[PDB]
Scaffold this active site. Structure first.
Site, PDB file in Angstrom:
ATOM      1  N   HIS A 231       0.812  -1.215   0.000  1.00  0.00           N
ATOM      2  CA  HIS A 231       0.000   0.000   0.000  1.00  0.00           C
ATOM      3  C   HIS A 231       0.846   1.265   0.000  1.00  0.00           C
ATOM      4  O   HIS A 231       0.330   2.347  -0.296  1.00  0.00           O
ATOM      5  CB  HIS A 231      -0.920   0.005   1.224  1.00  0.00           C
TER       6      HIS A 231
ATOM      7  N   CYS B 207       0.992   1.245  10.086  1.00  0.00           N
ATOM      8  CA  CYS B 207       1.091   0.302   8.973  1.00  0.00           C
ATOM      9  C   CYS B 207       2.497  -0.278   8.881  1.00  0.00           C
ATOM     10  O   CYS B 207       3.487   0.451   8.985  1.00  0.00           O
ATOM     11  CB  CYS B 207       0.731   1.008   7.665  1.00  0.00           C
TER      12      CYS B 207
ATOM     13  N   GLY C 180      -0.184   5.665  11.121  1.00  0.00           N
ATOM     14  CA  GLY C 180       1.256   5.529  11.047  1.00  0.00           C
ATOM     15  C   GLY C 180       1.774   4.162  11.426  1.00  0.00           C
ATOM     16  O   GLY C 180       2.967   3.896  11.252  1.00  0.00           O
TER      17      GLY C 180
END
Ligand SMILES: Cn1cc2cc(Nc3nc(=O)n(-c4cccnc4)c(=O)n3Cc3cc(F)c(F)cc3F)c(Cl)cc2n1
Ligand SMILES: Cn1cc2cc(Nc3nc(=O)n(-c4cccnc4)c(=O)n3Cc3cc(F)c(F)cc3F)c(Cl)cc2n1
Lengths: 302, 302
Positions: A41, A145, A143
């Site tokens: 992503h 991820c 944040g």
């Protein structure tokens, strides 16, 4: 004695955590040997996060589009690849802190430790279970991820989760380290719903055994039950059916406590039909299902 | 979102953990610069553990009586000293992994992360609070003596607890890193009783704010209360009186949620007088008091 939500010591994972930026999109990565793993992503822009075609997105990128930051040191990306939902960035430096490791996918009901990171910086460690709907009830902010979940076997870090996203209900979804999602989710900023969950029965029983090991015995009773009659009562309460394999797994705790599994099931049946009557077990007013038999043995026996 | 018992990442402490043996007595130590810190109880034999005179015991020892093991490397002891209930063993090698650190004593109601170790080997990490009776409800087995509790401020490890012993009720007692016990306990294998505990009210309020931040709102009400009337109700339930300093500390959470502290106190009063009526808050059926306002802000805001 005592019984706490216990995570594995996180140092070996902390030395692997890095920051990955592509464009203005940033998140966490996992630097092992000369590869950095992160959610694909990261190659999305705000325009692409809704309905991306990741093959197109990656073909349009080169090594120089990826900034990898390990502490204050920039690692030069010398290759890039997609593996399902994870990006693999080959860097020119092998991580000197690479632990012995493996990528293992876990089962609903099993547990792992999460090292929550932000901008490649570890901020906290907690323990969680993979729910039966393949979500985890984590603690994650924007944040996070790329934060990873893991277990430790002796000296070997078994990575089992990379965090991707938060669902509308506030629970979390991610992949194993080969980029394959846990559950029916996709790495698209679309409103995705977790399916129905159930209570992890074998874990509840493991935790009742932990309570007995710690001197909480008030819920015990003289009754025993058959596996089938227990399951007939437990399905009505949204508990997973108990199998003979689960009984076998609980063998060690049964032996250490002298309480047969089906006897403890009789206690669990009674707690389900009567509640706790204002009492607690191991400091909890509800039945805890995020401790496996293995976790109990590790904490209560060694 | 989500709210979990979250410990600090433990790597910086893991690189300090060592094994200390004197005679046949062994436990954990903390290697910082060229000093190893451990419970002085290690200089006791089974004969001396009941009623030791530690000054005599230490005068009868020399450097060569102390075996310090860092991984597989033996550190040679080149000096030894007592500081209250901790032994300080000067070794000939400064720990290359020494983090920036400080020794800080904590207050009842504050929290810290515990790195449980055995034979100098870190095995688990969990979060706990210093109770008002100066015990901690830890998770420790035989061999855990010398495990440390700590907080991390940026890059600085603030060590605040060294574990010594388990009390009859199964709760745990230890010292700060200057060897001064938390609470009225002594490092003698005698049956010592923890005093009465109270619920850490400010922490419960902090956790109610965390719940509101995570969308649990069912316990809220239109009522507000005075600080004094709240305290009159809360003392009856074994809660610490709430002070204006506690209100001030809760200012940030009050602002982020728009719920004044005394308004949340009205919710807490009602939950105390009525119970939860079978509902839960942040997955708990009882009010949680091991999260400080700071922990809540760190987890829910960043
Ligand atoms: C400059 N800038 C903006 C960014 C936004 C990003 N998106 C998220 N960030 C996150 O922290 N949480 C998140 C939030 C809370 C708990 N847990 C995870 C996301 O859910 N998303 C959404 C999300 C992430 C996925 F990986 C996915 F496949 C689908 C999604 F909808 C990221 Cl990943 C980087 C950013 N850089
Ligand atoms: C060969 N061998 C035998 C040893 C026995 C030892 N005693 C303990 N060990 C421990 O693990 N727990 C302990 C147990 C469970 C949780 N938490 C701590 C102790 O409480 N004690 C007792 C204790 C420790 C103190 F530090 C103290 F001041 C007074 C005490 F009564 C130790 Cl220290 C080393 C041994 N070596």
């Amino acid at each position: 004695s005592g019984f706490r939500k216990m995570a594995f010591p996180s140092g070996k994972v902390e030395g692997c955590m890095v920051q990955v930026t592509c464009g203005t999109t940033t998140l966490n990565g996992l630097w092992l040997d000369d590869v950095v793993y992160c959610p694909r992503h990261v190659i999305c822009t705000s325009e692409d996060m809704l309905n991306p075609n990741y093959e197109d997105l990656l073909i349009r990128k080169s090594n120089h589009n990826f900034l990898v930051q390990a502490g204050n040191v920039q690692l030069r990306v010398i290759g890039h690849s997609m593996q399902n939902c994870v990006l693999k960035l080959k860097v020119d430096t092998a991580n000197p802190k690479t632990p012995k490791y493996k990528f293992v996918r876990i089962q609903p009901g099993q547990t792992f430790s999460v090292l929550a990171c932000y901008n490649g910086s570890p901020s906290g460690v907690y323990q969680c279970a993979m729910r039966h709907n393949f979500t985890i009830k984590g603690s994650f902010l924007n944040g996070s991820c790329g934060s990873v979940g893991f277990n430790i076997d002796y000296d070997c870090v078994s990575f089992c989760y990379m965090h991707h996203m938060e669902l509308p209900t506030g629970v979390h979804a991610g992949t194993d380290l080969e980029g394959n999602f846990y559950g029916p989710f996709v790495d698209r900023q679309t409103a995705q719903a977790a399916g129905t969950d159930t209570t992890i029965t074998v874990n509840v029983l493991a935790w009742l055994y932990a309570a007995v090991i710690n001197g909480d015995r008030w819920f015990l009773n003289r009754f025993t039950t058959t596996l089938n009659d227990f399951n007939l009562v437990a399905m009505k309460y949204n508990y997973e059916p108990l199998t003979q394999d689960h009984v076998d797994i609980l063998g060690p705790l049964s032996a250490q406590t002298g309480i047969a599994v089906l006897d403890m099931c009789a206690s669990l049946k009674e707690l389900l039909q009567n509640g706790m009557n204002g009492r607690t077990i191991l400091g909890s007013a509800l039945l805890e299902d995020e401790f496996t038999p293995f976790d109990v043995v590790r904490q209560c026996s060694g």
